[PDB]
Each structure stands twice: as structure tokens, then as C-alpha cells.
Amino acid sequence: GPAVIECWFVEDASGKGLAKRPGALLLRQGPGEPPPRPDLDPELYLSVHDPAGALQAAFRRYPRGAPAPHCEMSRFVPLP
Amino acid sequence: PFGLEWRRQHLGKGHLLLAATPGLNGQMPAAQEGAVAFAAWDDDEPWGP
Amino acid sequence: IQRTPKIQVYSRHPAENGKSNFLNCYVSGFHPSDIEVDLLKNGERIEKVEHSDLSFSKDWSFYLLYYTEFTPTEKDEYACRVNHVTLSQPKIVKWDRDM
Amino acid sequence: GSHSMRYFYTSVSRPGRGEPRFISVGYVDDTQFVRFDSDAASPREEPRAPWIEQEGPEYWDRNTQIYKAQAQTDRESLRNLRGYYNQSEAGSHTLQSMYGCDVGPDGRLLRGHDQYAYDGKDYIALNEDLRSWTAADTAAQITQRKWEAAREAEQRRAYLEGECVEWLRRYLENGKDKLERADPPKTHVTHHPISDHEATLRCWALGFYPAEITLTWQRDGEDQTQDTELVETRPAGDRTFQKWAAVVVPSGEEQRYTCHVQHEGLPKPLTLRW
Numbered sequence: 001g002p003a004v005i006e007c008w009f010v011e012d013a014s015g016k017g018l019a020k021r022p023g024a025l026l027l028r029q030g031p032g033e034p035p036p037r038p039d040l041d042p043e044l045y046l047s048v049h050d051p052a053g054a055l056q057a058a059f060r061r062y063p064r065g066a067p068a069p070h071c072e073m074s075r076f077v078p079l080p
Numbered sequence: 081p082f083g084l085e086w087r088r089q090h091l092g093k094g095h096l097l098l099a100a101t102p103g104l105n106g107q108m109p110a111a112q113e114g115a116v117a118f119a120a121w122d123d124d125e126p127w128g129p
Numbered sequence: 130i131q132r133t134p135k136i137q138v139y140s141r142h143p144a145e146n147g148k149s150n151f152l153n154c155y156v157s158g159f160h161p162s163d164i165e166v167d168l169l170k171n172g173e174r175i176e177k178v179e180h181s182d183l184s185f186s187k188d189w190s191f192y193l194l195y196y197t198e199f200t201p202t203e204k205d206e207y208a209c210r211v212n213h214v215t216l217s218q219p220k221i222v223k224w225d226r227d228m
Numbered sequence: 229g230s231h232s233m234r235y236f237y238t239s240v241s242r243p244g245r246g247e248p249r250f251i252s253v254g255y256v257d258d259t260q261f262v263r264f265d266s267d268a269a270s271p272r273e274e275p276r277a278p279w280i281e282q283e284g285p286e287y288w289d290r291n292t293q294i295y296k297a298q299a300q301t302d303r304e305s306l307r308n309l310r311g312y313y314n315q316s317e318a319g320s321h322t323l324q325s326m327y328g329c330d331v332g333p334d335g336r337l338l339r340g341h342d343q344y345a346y347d348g349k350d351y352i353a354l355n356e357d358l359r360s361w362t363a364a365d366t367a368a369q370i371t372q373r374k375w376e377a378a379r380e381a382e383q384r385r386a387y388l389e390g391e392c393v394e395w396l397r398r399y400l401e402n403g404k405d406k407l408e409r410a411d412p413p414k415t416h417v418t419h420h421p422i423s424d425h426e427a428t429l430r431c432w433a434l435g436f437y438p439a440e441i442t443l444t445w446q447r448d449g450e451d452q453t454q455d456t457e458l459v460e461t462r463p464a465g466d467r468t469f470q471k472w473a474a475v476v477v478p479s480g481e482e483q484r485y486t487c488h489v490q491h492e493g494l495p496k497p498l499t500l501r502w
């Protein structure tokens with residue numbers, strides 16, 4: 001499936017509205033350095049490591065010739 | 081590229097039912113009994129597994 | 130999401146020929162709230178048509194009531210014509226004394 | 229019976245036609261008693277029911293200012309949600325908020341509501357427990373987590389279980405004449421030959437308030453749920469309601485069909501036989 005998923009980081013902080021920033025999820029790092037992305041903010045470019053493999057397996061059999069999935073990141077604070 | 085081999089054995093009789101080499105172009109022995117195989121990699125990503 | 134209006138055309142009281150009455154077109158369950166409604170007598174548009182304020186339902190849809198005084202009689206047809214963003218062309222629903 | 233109080237706020241953007249139009253309404257049992265409209269000549273919260281508890285023009289001015297502030301807030305929220313959903317600045321979008329409380333016949337709370345929807349689709353709603361929220365989108369989840377951190381459900385539950393019920397009881401006590409009346413339906417059955425071997429029996433219930441009525445056809449004393457056509461309850465236009473239920477019957481067998489009517493006005497359910 002896709003090697004990278006383009007994602008939109010949505011700002012949680014109040015007063016920022018819902019401003020979106022570009023980001024990427026590099027699912028498989030692979031040997032060697034990742035594809036350079038100077039356009040992305042370094043914090044929003046994420047090399048994903050999945051011990052359970054649910055995400056990796058979900059996007060390893062993704063149908064070929066299919067539209068790019070709609071991804072959105074946000075900051076999370078664990079609450080009960 | 082890899083090779084896939086399907087053979088039968090029964091009562092002292094053996095047949096090469098199917099031979100394929102997905103990812104490599106070459107002449108394979110004709111498949112027997114109209115058999116086909118879904119022989120392919122699930123993806124063409126540059127890095128394994 | 131957009132919802133088509135649902136239209137009912139009826140009278141305030143059971144119709145009696147020669148008796149003054151009100152003809153109501155009740156439009157309900159449409160979204161967004163922009164809607165055009167006319168009451169037709171024999172096709173022509175009735176001028177003095179009143180209506181209630183735009184109302185709000187618990188399920189995020191809107192409804193309206195258009196009423197006009199009339200005296201039902203035979204040979205006179207009345208219908209409600211409704212135009213909404215969800216309708217390719219205006220929909221006219223006929224008035225039957227028993228519906 | 230079971231009464232309710234609802235407050236609706238709706239902001240509808242009108243691109244190229246001025247600022248968004250804001251409307252605020254209050255209902256007791258689907259009966260309007262206050263209305264603010266920005267398109268009005270003199271934007272002001274105006275009573276629409278004589279049974280309301282009027283408390284001087286100062287209170288009305290305060291409510292007008294409150295609703296103007298809510299209008300500004302809803303304009304800002306409309307712009308924010310239009311930006312988030314990647315929608316053009318040419319279309320028209322609406323933002324709706326609804327909060328209120330339902331109360332039983334004994335004046336005890338049953339269900340409090342505080343919901344927001346965007347373009348007619350649920351955006352974020354307070355759950356029945358009055359503790360958690362339901363949010364499907366990422367922006368809705370951001371606001372949900374903000375509120376959960378801020379403990380907004382606590383204040384909302386305190387209001388819904390408190391002032392909401394108190395004001396609903398006060399309105400119902402000031403409006404016994406209308407809000408707490410029960411007009412029984414006027415019922416009659418009509419016959420329409422629909423074919424050479426079938427007819428239609430229609431049961432009409434007219435002029436009944438409130439709108440909670442039940443009409444049911446029974447064949448040989450048993451329910452006839454199959455092929456029983458209904459129309460939605462509709463306003464007669466004079467504070468009452470109309471409804472009818474139709475069934476299709478073999479010709480000559482109409483004597484074996486009974487219409488059953490249940491309404492608060494009726495001391496006992498009515499049985500009609502054409």
C-alpha cells in the first residue's frame with residue numbers, strides 16, 4: 001500500500017480556530033534515511049513504528065489505484 | 081523474483097501441474113489440467129518483508 | 130446533508146361547498162431553511178397567503194404553515210407548489226377533500 | 229402529560245448578501261414564547277406568548293444583548309467550521325444549537341439536551357447521562373476534550389436539573405389555560421370505493437390537542453398493522469391538530485374493521501365502526 005500518508009494536523013489550542021498544518025506519516029522507515037521533507041514541520045513528520053501491526057497491515061493490503069485516505073492528526077491528553 | 085511449483089504424487093505417479101516465475105520473464109512448462117495459480121507478491125514496496 | 134420538504138395540503142375544517150374555510154399547506158422536514166411555497170387555485174397563484182414564522186424541530190429540520198381563506202366549491206382546484214434546493218423542478222401536490 | 233422546554237439558535241450564512249442571519253427561539257411543548265431575529269427591523273428578543281413571565285423592559289434588553297453576543301459567537305463558529313471542512317466561501321451553511329429539558333407529568337426531569345449541529349448533521353451532543361459527549365469529527369472531538377477537561381457537563385447538568393425545570397414549571401403554571409389543556413379529538417370514518425372488489429376506510433381525528441394521538445385499525449378485534457397508511461400529525465392552524473389513518477378492505481367486509489383512537493382528551497379509547 002502507500003508508503004506515506006499525507007495528514008493534516010489540527011490545532012487543539014483555543015484561539016487558533018481549527019488551523020490545519022501539513023504533515024506526513026511514513027509507515028515503513030525502511031533501510032536508509034527517510035525521504036527528506038523540508039516542506040513539512042519536523043514534528044508533524046512521523047516515522048511510525050507499530051508493534052501490534054494493525055495499522056501496518058491495514059495499509060499493506062490497501063487496494064491499488066484507490067484515492068488517498070483522509071488523515072488528521074491532533075494532540076491528545078489522556079483523561080479518564 | 082520467485083518461483084512457484086505445484087506437483088502431484090499418488091500411487092507411484094507424479095506430474096508437474098504448474099510452474100511459474102513471477103517477476104521474471106521466461107518460458108515455463110505448460111500448465112496441466114487447465115490449472116492456474118494466483119502467484120504474485122501482495123505488494124511491490126521497495127523494502128521487505 | 131440536505132433534506133427534501135414534505136408537503137401536505139388540507140383544510141382547517143371538513144370542506145363544505147359554499148362554506149368559508151382555510152386552506153393549509155404544511156411543509157416540514159427540509160434542510161436548509163430556504164424554501165418557496167405557493168398556493169394555487171386552478172393554477173393561478175393566490176395573492177393573500179399568510180404563513181407562520183419559520184419553526185425549528187429537534188432533528189435540525191424546519192417547517193412552515195401557509196394558510197389562506199377560501200370557500201371550497203366544485204370545479205375549483207387547489208394545490209400547493211413547493212420549490213427547494215433539493216428539487217430539480219417545483220413539486221405540486223393536489224388538494225383532496227379526503228386527504 | 230409530558231412537557232418540554234427547548235431553546236434553538238440558528239445562524240445561516242448568506243455569502244454576498246451581508247452577515248449571517250441569527251435566529252433564537254424558545255418553545256414550551258412546541259409553542260413559541262420568545263423569538264429574536266437579526267433580520268428584524270429592531271433586533272430585540274420579543275415575547276410571543278401571553279403566559280410568559282414578563283419582568284420589565286430591562287430584562288428584555290439584557291436578553292437582546294445576550295442574543296447579540298450569541299450571534300457574534302455563532303458567526304465566528306460558522307467561519308471556523310467553514311475553514312475546517314474545506315468549503316468554498318460561496319455556499320450557504322448553517323450552525324444550530326439546541327438546549328432544553330423534558331419533564332414528566334409530575335414535574336420531574338426526564339431528559340436534558342444540549343446539542344450542536346452543522347449543516348443539519350450532528351456535530352456534538354450531550355449524552356443522556358449528562359456526563360459525556362458524542363463527537364464523530366476531529367474538530368468535534370477537540371471541543372469535546374476541551375469541555376471534558378473544563379468540566380462543562382457539570383455546569384450544564386446543574387442548569388438543566390435546576391433553572392430549566394423551575395422555569396418550565398413556572399411557564400406551565402402561568403399557562404394552565406393553553407399549555408395544560410386537553411381537547412378530545414372529533415372522530416369519523418369515511419368510505420371510498422377504490423375498486424370493484426375493494427374499498428378504503430379512513431379514520432379522521434380532528435381538533436385535538438396536544439399532538440400525541442394514536443390511531444389503529446383492528447380486523448376482528450386484532451391489530452391490522454399490515455398495510456395501514458398514516459399521515460403525519462399536522463396543525464389545523466388554530467392550535468389544534470388533525471390526523472387520519474386509512475386501511476384497504478374487501479368490499480362487503482367493512483363491518484369487521486374497527487378504528488381505535490387513544491388521546492388524553494378521551495376518558496376512554498374510542499372505537500369507530502363505519
Ligand SMILES: *[C@@H]1O[C@H](CO)[C@@H](O)[C@H](O)[C@H]1NC(C)=O
Pocket residue numbers: 008020314
Ligand atoms: C481542499 O480541497 C482542495 C481540493 O481537493 C485541495 O487541493 C486542498 O488541499 C484542500 N485543503 C485542505 C486544507 O484540506
